[PDB]
Design a protein around this nucleic acid. Structure first.
Ligand SMILES: [Mg+2]
Ligand SMILES: [Zn+2]
Ligand SMILES: [Zn+2]
Ligand SMILES: [Zn+2]
Lengths: 229, 93, 58, 519, 84, 107, 88, 171, 168
RNA sequence: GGUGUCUUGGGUG
């Protein structure tokens, strides 16, 4: 459902690497003292340890990430490729948020884990390629934005948000709102003559071009032949 | 303003510009059609304000259409080859 | 392509052309149901009646 | 607004309904019967009535009016006549389908060889498409060689029992071999005989083969009365200041009239059966090549100079025919063309327009209470100085040419009037280079007026146009209303095309010196 | 019969590029015919720029009728579609 | 289902449709050696029910002739016993969105 | 009659060499009689609407059949400017 | 005879009129336009039922002109004569070659040949009128007359009747 | 300009002689179809108004629109004035004076009573409510179609009509 | 106030 000018190549970070690297990047543990959040990044570091009504949510997040890993590796991209043209850049949003809110000095972050998890969940339930309360509408809507939700969850993970990007609450809310708005802007407009555009996008490159290739092969393909060279 | 120029204007979605290129910057014309038989056989006397399709014996259900002069010529050539193109201004089914 | 033969076949079978395409509206010099011509622009009264009462038709 | 007032309502074409024209309707919509060949009266002013240049057909002269509608040459659409034929003839563009129907039907009583009794045909009827239904009925009904009188106790379907002919095509002549019961007596099937057979087909039978009761009757594929197009469709031309030759269609119609009259000189007196066929076949050939001069396996109707006649089909087909040469694309006003040049000092969406072109082209600008002073200053300036104006349009459509108007100082501009001022700075114009391989070959630019006769382009836009400055030329189109100005500026403008959907990357970059220099 | 009630309108709430272009063109043409102007005109005299000013302040009194492929349509006032 | 080895003569073939209300289908053994629904390029087809087909048509405000189509002789339509008017749902790999559901109606 | 000026022709309907000519100006005046006063149509040859110049050599003779024959050569100078094409 | 007629009228509105009191201006324009007109296809439009409550709907802007089109639908009353319909009247004019009678909004003329022969004209009577032994036709009289003709002229139509048939004439 | 529910009337190959009017023979024209339509396209029986129903309808519409014109605050020669325009006033004045010179039912009550009593083809239905007729003869001769229907009832209907006719 | 039609050959982009 996206306009073809609005997408940019982006790496899907849950796909590549070994399971140990994935685990170190993505898995958080509350009971385990060493493998938890680094204390020197958050105000509330001491209050975190040992909790349960939050380690449940952390485990739910990690299980969603593992589901995404399995899905992308087994259904969509079986050969491992993880750099694909997707809608709404994430790197540039994060760095713009860092620039705007001046995220230096690694200051203690006042951004709690449950607020991060619920923020990303709400964002993932706000990207509308199709609008309607119908049930086939919901199914098509979720199939439409499955890959982009996988991307948004691969980037906005709890450990990554807290350690690698060190966002505070304001920068976090700004990232979510900007993703919302730019996704709503990346959608194709009704009235596009996508057939003429596609015909031109395929035909124009043909003006610059023992397997048969190039113009004769494209001619064979379009003039569907019962036998080929 | 050939066919590929039309393709580019269609890709741009500029319908009004295309209509204005092909009509007001070129052979725009006015014809009267019979609302019943749809042939351009309506005899119009604009200074006397009187109209008639003699085939249908009609004088009240007649409409004017702004169309390219080449389109009027095309319909007249079709009539010349016994083909009847019938221009109707409303859909039925 | 095959303009004359296709027109003859349309005559011999009394085809009805629904005029929903692009090229058909192009050759008749009408606004195509495409891009800027894929919708209609009405005149809104609910918003209009908010105008000052001295801006009225006389 | 350039059309004189008519009281009829203005509507748009929603449906086109093709079909054949019946002889009744051809006579009905006509206005004068055409029978006299000779163009002029006796080479005397205002030629012979009932000829191919009857003034009832309409006016093609500037100082004469149409005797049918009373309108000037500009407004008169032209009016059709009719010309009854002595004998019926085949329409050249329908011979194969005439042959198919001849094979399908019973050539004596006008009935389908097989009925709805047979479930195969009973299900071939069940196709909604007329053409698929006709094919599915022809692929079955073509082999039964009798009109069986009994429906499959003895149950009669109403049939007759006469044997069927083996239809064949030789040119424009439909041969039908009747294999009686040995010697198959093969007879020629004339258009009149096929017309008689075809008039007997019943409405439901006609529907089954895929025809129509109101629009396409199978006998209307045989010509008995011929429409005569107005002279607009076949206008004359001038060769050396005093000479005119008629269009090909006019001479073709004259030849048809000669053939018709020769036919009317045989069924009125002695005619020993070997001249009637010859002259009727001459009529058939003239009528055929009047419509289609590309018939396989025969000579072509030729002109005096050796060239073939421009038939109507040839008028309609090809790159230069009506559809692709006059309807899908056409020549347009308010355009300009000249060599392009590069200008490092222009903005990306600016094009430099020569003064002479800026003065030749124009934009009609409605006078309002925000532009009346500026427009009256342009009116004072005149059509020979920039910024000036070329025309003033009054509130009823009357043009005031400001060249020949010697008293340009005594015009006061009314509201709602229109001034056709010159092309000026920042006007949006569509700019274009052929071939137009993609949507970024035609882009909207802001105007900047400059001396010299060459266009100016910022050099970063030369990549989407695929242009360079060694001879190339580009076209400029001026939008003639505010709606088209807004469309250009809000959809086609150069800044809006920097990123392309073809490969979701920019198409304009930094090129040539600006690059090498930045390195 | 073919109009859609204001509750079940399931099209996009955002003005598209084509709708915006045509709305601006139509308003500019209207204003150039000495129609009344709803915004306060401070500096600009060009009808297109005045139309842009009206569009930004959600004060264009027009309606977009969006036809669906089945022939039905939805009506949206210009002031309730969202302009970026 | 009538699986044969070499050929089925047209005279025998003609009895298949005139034996209502039962349905007779035939396959050749050579055709059945490989299961084509296991091929990687063949996504999983799931026939809709009548109510679900109606739901699909109303959600898209569609008529039957305005759907993408599948031939009755299609190897996967032949494998699934699709009758005229029945709608399959085809979920398949999508490199731009991950997952995509397509619908085809049987000719 | 054409919309150009006829005030440059001599009594023979021909302009003389040495006279500046602009576009749309008549350089050869000719009349065609009206078949059966005011009994003539014009067949005058204007200058091309684009070109300026100066008349150089007005030739006058008779053709194979003895009818009058005229050739008028114009001259002008073109100075290079923006948009002229050059190559090595 | 009066017929209840649902009818419409397509209209064109200039941008200069695009104000806050639009619907009432179009209602007045419609009321002015239709109250009184004759149409060969309908009869005579005397009034319009529920005139102030006509719905102008939503107008469409014509592309290229900027004027709004309205399909103002409403139900009105129309009066049409038909050949072979009986219509009462009162005589208006008198003349040796026949007389005129005003019917509804219209005027009906009866010819000399279509009058009972007991009727004798008088140019000298006060008031001048036809008389008869037991029959009278003077100004103000009632006439139950059948219509045997109606010409459709676009602006004004005229009907010529005949009182020559039984059960008709003076009552 | 003046249009109605009658739309296409598209061209079949054949014509029809049965298009001229002859009110004796139930031929009125292709504008008064036996089943009319409304402005919502729904089917609806033809309407043929007698002079009484028509006078009541016009009076009602005029007084309603007059009350609308006055902001919320008796004779046809005055009641026709409610229209706008001189041509409007003249045409409605002629119609109203014709109605008020021949309205046998000079109230809504008796018009409603005859509506109830009558409810059959609206043509003769209205012509009976508009044309007083003494006995069966006048009806069956001015309306020659009551003969070949074998449902007459003219005797009692005309009796009750002239009975309900108010004095003058 | 109204400046005609078709083919052949040689080039420009
Ligand atoms: Mg080049
Ligand atoms: Zn007609
Ligand atoms: Zn004419
Ligand atoms: Zn037979």
């Amino acid at each position: 459902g996206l306009d073809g000018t609005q997408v940019e190549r982006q790496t899907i970070d849950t796909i590549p690497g070994s399971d140990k690297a994935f685990h170190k990047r993505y898995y958080v543990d509350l009971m385990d003292e060493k493998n938890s959040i680094k204390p020197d990044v958050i105000e509330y570091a001491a209050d975190i340890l040992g909790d349960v009504e939050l380690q449940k949510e952390l485990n739910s997040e990690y299980e969603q990430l593992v589901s995404d890993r399995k899905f992308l590796r087994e259904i969509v991209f079986v050969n491992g490729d993880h750099n694909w043209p997707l809608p709404v850049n994430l790197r540039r949003i994060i760095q713009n948020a860092q620039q705007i809110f001046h995220l230096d000095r690694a200051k203690a972050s006042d951004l709690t884990i449950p607020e991060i998890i619920h923020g990303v969940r709400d964002l993932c339930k706000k990207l509308f390629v199709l609008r309607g309360e119908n049930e086939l509408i919901k199914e098509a809507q979720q199939n439409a934005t499955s890959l982009f939700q996988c991307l948004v969850r691969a980037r906005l993970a709890t450990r990554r948000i807290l350690e690698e990007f060190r966002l505070n609450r304001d920068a976090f809310e700004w990232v979510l709102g900007t993703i919302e708005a730019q996704f709503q802007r990346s959608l194709v407009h009704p009235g596009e003559m996508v057939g003429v555009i596609a015909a031109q996008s395929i035909g124009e490159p043909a003006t610059q071009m023992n397997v048969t290739l190039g113009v004769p092969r494209l001619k064979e393909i379009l003039n569907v032949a019962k036998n080929i060279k | 303003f050939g066919e590929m120029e039309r393709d580019c204007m269609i890709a741009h979605g500029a319908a009004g510009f295309l209509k204005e290129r092909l009509m007001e910057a070129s052979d725009a014309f006015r014809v009267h059609v019979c609302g019943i038989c749809g042939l351009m056989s309506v005899i119009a006397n604009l200074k006397k304000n009187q109209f008639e399709c003699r085939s249908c014996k009609n004088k009240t259900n007649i409409y004017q259409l702004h169309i390219p002069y080449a389109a009027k010529l095309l319909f007249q050539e079709l009539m010349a080859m016994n083909i009847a193109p019938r221009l109707y201004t409303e859909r039925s089914g | 392509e095959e303009t004359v033969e296709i027109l003859f076949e349309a005559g011999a079978a009394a085809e009805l052309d629904d005029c929903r395409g692009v090229s058909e509206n192009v050759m008749l010099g009408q606004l195509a149901p495409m891009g800027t011509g894929a919708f209609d622009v009405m005149i809104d009264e609910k918003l209009l009646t908010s105008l000052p009462a001295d801006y009225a038709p006389t | 607004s350039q059309f004189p007032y008519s009281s009829a309502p203005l509507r748009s074409v929603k449906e086109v309904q093709f079909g054949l024209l019946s002889p009744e309707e051809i006579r009905a919509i006509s206005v004068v019967k055409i029978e006299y060949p000779e163009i002029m009266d006796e080479s005397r002013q205002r030629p012979r009535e009932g000829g191919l240049n009857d003034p009832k057909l309409g006016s093609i002269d500037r100082n004469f009016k149409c005797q049918t509608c009373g309108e000037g040459m500009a407004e008169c659409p032209g009016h059709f006549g009719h010309m009854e034929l002595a004998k019926p003839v085949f329409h050249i563009g329908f011979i194969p389908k005439i042959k198919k129907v001849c094979e399908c039907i019973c050539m004596n009583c006008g009935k389908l060889l097989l009925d709805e009794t047979n479930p195969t045909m009973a299900q071939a009827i069940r196709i909604r498409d007329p053409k698929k239904r006709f094919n599915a009925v022809w692929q079955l009904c073509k082999t039964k060689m009798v009109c069986e009188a009994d429906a499959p106790k003895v149950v009669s379907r109403g049939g007759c029992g006469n044997t069927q002919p083996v239809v064949r095509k030789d040119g424009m002549k439909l041969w039908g071999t009747w294999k009686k019961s040995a010697q198959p007596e093969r007879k020629l099937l004339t258009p009149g005989e096929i017309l008689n057979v075809f008039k007997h087909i019943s409405p439901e039978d006609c529907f089954r083969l895929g025809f129509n009761e109101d629009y396409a009757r199978p006998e209307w594929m045989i010509i008995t009365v011929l429409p005569v197009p107005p002279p607009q469709v076949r206008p004359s031309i001038a060769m050396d200041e005093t000479t005119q030759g008629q269009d090909d269609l006019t001479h073709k119609l004259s030849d048809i009239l000669k053939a018709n009259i020769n036919v009317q000189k045989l069924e009125m007196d002695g005619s020993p059966q070997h001249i009637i066929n010859e002259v009727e076949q001459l009529l058939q050939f003239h009528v055929a090549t009047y419509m289609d001069n590309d018939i396989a396996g025969q000579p072509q109707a030729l002109q005096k100079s050796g060239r073939p006649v421009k038939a109507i089909r040839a008028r309609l087909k090809g790159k230069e025919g009506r559809l692709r040469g006059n309807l899908m694309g056409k020549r347009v006003d308010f355009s300009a063309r000249t060599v392009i040049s590069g200008d490092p000092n222009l903005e990306l969406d600016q094009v430099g327009v020569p003064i002479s072109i800026a003065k030749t082209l124009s934009y009609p600008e409605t006078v309002t209470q925000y532009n009346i002073h500026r427009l009256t200053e342009y009116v004072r300036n005149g059509p020979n100085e920039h910024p000036g104006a070329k025309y003033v349009i009054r509130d009823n459509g009357d043009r005031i040419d400001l060249r020949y108007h010697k008293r340009a100082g005594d015009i006061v501009l009314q509201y709602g009037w229109k001034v056709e001022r010159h092309l000026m700075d920042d006007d949006p114009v569509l700019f274009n280079r052929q071939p137009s391989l993609h949507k970024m070959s035609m882009m909207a630019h802001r105007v900047k007026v400059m001396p010299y006769s060459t266009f100016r382009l910022n050099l970063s836009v030369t990549s989407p146009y695929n242009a360079d400055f060694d001879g190339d030329e580009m076209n400029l189109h001026v939008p003639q209303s505010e709606e088209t100005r807004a469309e250009l500026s809000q959809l086609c403008a150069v800044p809006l095309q920097i990123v392309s959907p073809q490969s979701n990357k920019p198409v304009m970059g930094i090129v040539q010196d600006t690059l090498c220099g930045v390195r | 019969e073919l109009a859609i009630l204001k509750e079940e309108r399931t099209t996009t709430p955002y003005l598209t590029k084509y709708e915006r272009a045509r709305i601006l063109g139509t308003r500019a043409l209207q204003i150039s015919m000495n129609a009344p102007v709803l915004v306060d005109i401070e500096g600009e005299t060009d009808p297109l720029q005045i139309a842009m000013k009206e569009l930004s302040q959600r004060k264009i009194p027009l309606v977009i009728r969006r036809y669906l492929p089945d022939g039905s349509y939805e009506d949206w006032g210009c002031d309730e579609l969202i302009v970026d | 289902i009538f699986i044969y080895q070499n050929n089925i003569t047209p005279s025998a073939n003609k009895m298949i449709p005139t034996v209502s209300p039962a349905i007779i289908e035939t396959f050749q053994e050579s055709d059945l050696v490989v299961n084509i629904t296991h091929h990687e390029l063949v996504p999983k087809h799931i026939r809709l029910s009548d109510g679900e087909k109606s739901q699909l048509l109303q959600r898209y405000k569609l008529k039957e002739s305005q759907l993408p189509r599948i031939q009755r002789e299609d190897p996967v339509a032949r494998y699934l016993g699709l009758k005229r008017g029945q709608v399959v749902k085809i979920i398949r790999r999508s490199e731009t969105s991950g997952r995509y559901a397509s619908y085809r109606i049987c000719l | 009659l054409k919309h150009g000026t006829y005030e440059k022709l001599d009594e023979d309907g021909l302009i003389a060499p040495g006279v500046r000519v602009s576009g749309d100006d008549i350089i050869i005046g000719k009349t065609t009689p009206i078949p059966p006063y005011h009994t003539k149509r014009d067949a005058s040859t204007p200058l091309r609407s684009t070109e300026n110049g100066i008349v150089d050599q007005v030739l006058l003779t008779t053709n194979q059949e003895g009818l009058k024959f005229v050739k008028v050569r114009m001259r002008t100078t073109k100075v290079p400017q923006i948009g002229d094409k050059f190559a090595s | 005879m009066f017929f209840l007629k649902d009818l419409s009228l397509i209209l064109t509105l200039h941008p200069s009129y695009f104000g806050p009191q639009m619907n009432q201006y179009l209602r007045e324009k419609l009321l002015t336009d239709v109250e009184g007109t004759c149409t060969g296809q309908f009869g005579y439009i005397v009034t319009v039922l529920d005139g102030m409550n006509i719905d102008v709907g939503k107008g469409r802007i014509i592309p290229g002109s900027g004027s709004a089109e309205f399909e103002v639908k409403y139900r009105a009353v129309v009066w049409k004569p038909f050949k072979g319909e009986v219509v009462d009247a009162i005589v208006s004019n008198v003349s040796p070659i026949g007389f005129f009678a005003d019917v509804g909004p219209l005027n009906v003329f009866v010819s000399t040949r279509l009058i009972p022969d007991n009727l004798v004209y008088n140019p000298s009577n006060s008031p001048p009128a036809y008389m008869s032994n037991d029959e009278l036709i003077t100004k103000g009289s009632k006439v139950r007359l059948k219509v045997v003709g109606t010409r459709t002229d676009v602006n004004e139509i005229y009907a010529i009747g005949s009182i020559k048939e039984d059960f008709l004439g003076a009552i | 300009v003046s249009t109605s529910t009658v739309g296409a009337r598209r061209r079949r190959a054949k014509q029809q002689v049965d298009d001229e009017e002859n009110a004796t023979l139930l031929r009125l024209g292709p504008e008064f179809a036996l089943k009319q339509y409304d402005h919502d396209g729904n089917e609806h029986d033809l309407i043929a108004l007698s002079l009484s129903e028509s006078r009541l309808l016009i009076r009602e519409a005029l007084k309603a629109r007059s009350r609308a014109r006055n902001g919320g605050v008796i004779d046809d020669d005055e009641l026709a004035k409610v229209t706008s325009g001189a041509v409007a006033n003249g045409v409605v004045k002629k119609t109203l004076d014709y109605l008020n010179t021949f309205a046998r039912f000079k109230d809504e009550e008796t018009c409603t009573a005859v509506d109830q009593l009558l409810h059959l083809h609206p043509f003769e239905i209205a012509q009976l409510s508009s044309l007083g007729c003494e006995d069966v003869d006048e009806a069956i001769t001015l309306i020659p179609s009551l003969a070949a229907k074998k449902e007459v009832n003219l005797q009692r209907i005309l009796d009750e009509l002239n009975r309900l006719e108010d004095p003058y």
